[PDB]
């Protein structure tokens, strides 16, 4: 009977709440009250990469910190050289509706996907010299939202049927499926040691997954609406999320609870992208009022504003060396800040 | 060796830019329409389906969305730069659901500059349903509604000419309130036997572009 199972679920939730409250001895603000402020930081535009035809939905850097890939609903991907503002490749696509793009750590492959429910892998360092489709990965039901490369042979993808998958590119099959979510999964971030990854979905919840075992270990709750952006702390023991209630929160993995919240009275728009810096002191968030804001991760006070985009800001990324920040928006421009 | 690499990069950039201009010339001359709702009929006239047809030497492109869940609050934001959105309504409680979907589409933040064409199919079903022995139950305003003086009846009952303009006015009440001059609505009465739907779409797109140009010049 459903009644006893519901009662047992409520009892377990109450036990979890008591266990969590038994460990909240102090807050982060009280601990960091004596730390000096970071101070005002002003950073200016350095490059403007023009050449796209329609809105830009995703972009990704490379491990070499010089090349990046951009995808637009025009139906093309372009690989740029930031140092000399010269393009290196331009790959035509079959379907013109794209939502994500990825760059392999080695630098040999790129991936794309969207409303066609197919992830396509492209080979760059080819003997003939022309980019071609290497494989098409099929099996999902809804649209693809994000994709990341574990290595040259594994890839993890998140889709709109409330599922995530791990593929083997060579064979073209699924190794493990991840289930548990109720709404569409929007973003995912890999751990620096590629052993774990987090996923954010449209149910105000985020979960920690184990790649080898394929089971969910922790579930985090405390938001108010759908979450769109997720990022990992460089340490590997924290992560930050952005949602549609105009709020960013910081969670921790060893205490299983929210640590801090970032909000302001004048901000009433949503959050699209969230990223950190190298040291972890700075948090960059891109909003829907055509602005990008820089926060202090241990003090919850604003430190600056990035302006210059005439439409909504969709993608955000920080170079591995931490020397640049790249933002792309819906007006078909990329700008590199420093 | 650096100079040689720079020269190679410059040559590659020039070639890519030439190809990009060639692709621009073709992309910027095709009109994109999204169809959501009897749809298949109007179409014979995977994640997504595409069809291409040309009328009067103008290229058009239609998209039908399938194999997706009913939760469509996240992927509807892709279709903001399309020329028009085609809405198909059975028009024969499903009408209330259609009205709520139209209301949600109309007032969305990211679709404030996009216009809607609206097709009301199955009028033949309406004719017999009316003159076969009742819409005062799901709509109690029907008892105080009169056929407008600016109507346009077709030859062949004065109780079928009613309730068509009733559904039309229910759909137009949303359109004419809480909407600026950025987008409009174009309602048409079609059946499965109609063959002139392409011409209606052509004329409506022409009107959309002309009205946008007039708004730009602050002449309207």
């Amino acid at each position, epitope marked *: 009977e459903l009644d006893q199972l519901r009662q047992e679920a409520e009892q377990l939730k109450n036990q979890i709440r008591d266990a969590r409250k038994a460990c909240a001895d102090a807050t982060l603000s009280q601990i960091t009250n004596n730390i000096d402020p970071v101070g005002r930081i002003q950073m200016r535009t350095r490059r403007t990469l023009r050449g796209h035809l329609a809105k830009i939905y995703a972009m990704h850097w490379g491990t070499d910190s010089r090349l990046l890939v951009s995808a637009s609903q025009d139906g093309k991907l372009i690989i740029w050289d930031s140092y000399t503002t010269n393009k290196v490749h331009a790959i035509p696509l079959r379907s013109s509706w794209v939502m994500t793009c990825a760059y392999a750590p080695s630098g040999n492959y790129v991936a794309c996907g969207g409303l066609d429910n197919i992830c396509s892998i492209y080979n760059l360092k080819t003997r003939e010299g022309n980019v071609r489709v290497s494989r098409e990965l099929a099996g999902h039901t809804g649209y693809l939202s994000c994709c990341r490369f574990l290595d040259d042979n594994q890839i993890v993808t998140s889709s709109g049927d409330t599922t995530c998958a791990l593929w083997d590119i060579e064979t073209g099959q699924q190794t493990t499926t991840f289930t548990g979510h*109720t*709404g569409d999964v929007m973003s995912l971030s890999l751990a620096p040691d590629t052993r774990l990854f987090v996923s954010g979905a*449209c*149910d*105000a919840s985020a979960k920690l997954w184990d790649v080898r075992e394929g089971m969910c270990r922790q579930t985090f*709750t*405390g938001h*108010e*609406s*759908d979450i769109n952006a997720i990022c990992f702390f460089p340490n590997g023991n924290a992560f930050a999320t952005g949602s*549609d*209630d105009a709020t960013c929160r910081l969670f921790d993995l060893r205490a299983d609870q929210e640590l801090m919240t970032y909000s302001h009275d004048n901000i*009433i728009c*949503g959050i699209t992208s969230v990223s950190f810096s190298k040291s972890g002191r700075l948090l960059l968030a891109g909003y829907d009022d055509f602005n990008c804001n820089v926060w202090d991760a241990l003090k919850a006070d604003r430190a600056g504003v990035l302006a210059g985009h005439d439409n909504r800001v969709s993608c955000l990324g920080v170079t591995d060396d931490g020397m640049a920040v790249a933002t792309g928006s819906w007006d078909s421009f990329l700008k590199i800040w420093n | 060796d650096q100079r040689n690499e720079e020269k190679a990069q410059r040559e590659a950039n020039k070639k890519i830019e030439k190809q990009l201009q060639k692709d621009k010339q073709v992309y910027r001359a095709t009109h994109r329409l999204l169809l959501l709702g009897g749809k298949n009929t109007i179409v014979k006239q995977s994640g997504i389906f595409e069809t291409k047809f040309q009328v009067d030497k103008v290229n058009f492109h239609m998209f039908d969305v399938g194999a997706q*869940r*009913d*939760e*469509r*609050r996240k992927w*509807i934001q892709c279709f903001n730069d399309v020329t028009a959105i085609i809405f198909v309504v059975a028009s024969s*409680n499903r009408l*209330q*659901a259609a009205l*709520k979907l139209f*209301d*949600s589409i109309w*007032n*969305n*933040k990211w679709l404030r500059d996009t216009s809607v064409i609206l097709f009301l199919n199955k009028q033949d079903l309406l004719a017999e349903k009316v003159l076969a022995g009742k819409i005062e*139950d*799901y*709509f*109690p305003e029907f008892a105080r509604y009169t056929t407008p003086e600016d109507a346009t009846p077709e030859p062949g009952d004065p109780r079928v000419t009613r309730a068509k303009y009733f559904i039309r006015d229910e759909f137009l009440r949303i359109s004419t309130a*809480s909407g600026d001059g950025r987008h409009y609505c174009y309602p048409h009465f079609t059946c499965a036997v109609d063959t002139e739907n392409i011409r209606r779409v052509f004329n409506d797109c022409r009107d959309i572009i002309q009205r946008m140009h007039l708004r730009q010049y602050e002449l309207l």
Partner: nanobody, 126 residues
Framework: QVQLQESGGGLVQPGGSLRLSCAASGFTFSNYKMNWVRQAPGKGLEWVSDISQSGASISYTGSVKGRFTISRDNAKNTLYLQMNSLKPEDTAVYYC?????????????????????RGQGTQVTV
């Protein structure tokens, strides 16, 4: 966490009266638009009423006008829905749904199945 508990259902004779309530915890009640949906036996979800963040705008479906009245108490975080002049065709489970995003006029994906922000529901039988 977000949670919506509703109560007040039961069995009433034709021409009766009932008052259903919903208690909301986990979000700012004054920033959202609230709804009432119902599911008849062997049918899909159907929209009944709506309410704005201040109570100015109220809309009802065609078959319930005059019979049903809606209310909103922001101080106590409660949503009511007064029912009178009941008819046998009103036997269903009644849910309480909330708009996905705050400070928004549109309301997407409320009458859909597998919707996150919705309660368990109270059974009403006539």
């Amino acid at each position: 966490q977000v949670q919506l508990q509703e109560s007040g259902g039961g069995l009433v004779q034709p021409g009766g009266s009932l008052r259903l309530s919903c208690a909301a915890s986990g979000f700012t009640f004054s920033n959202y638009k609230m709804n009432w949906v119902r599911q008849a036996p062997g049918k899909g979800l159907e929209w009944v009423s709506d309410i704005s963040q201040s109570g100015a705008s109220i809309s009802y479906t065609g078959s319930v006008k005059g019979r049903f009245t809606i209310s909103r108490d922001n101080a106590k975080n409660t949503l009511y829905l007064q029912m009178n002049s009941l008819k046998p065709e009103d036997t269903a489970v009644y849910y309480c749904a909330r708009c996905p995003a705050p400070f928004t006029r549109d309301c997407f994906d409320v009458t859909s199945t597998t919707y996150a922000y919705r309660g368990q529901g109270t059974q009403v039988t006539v």
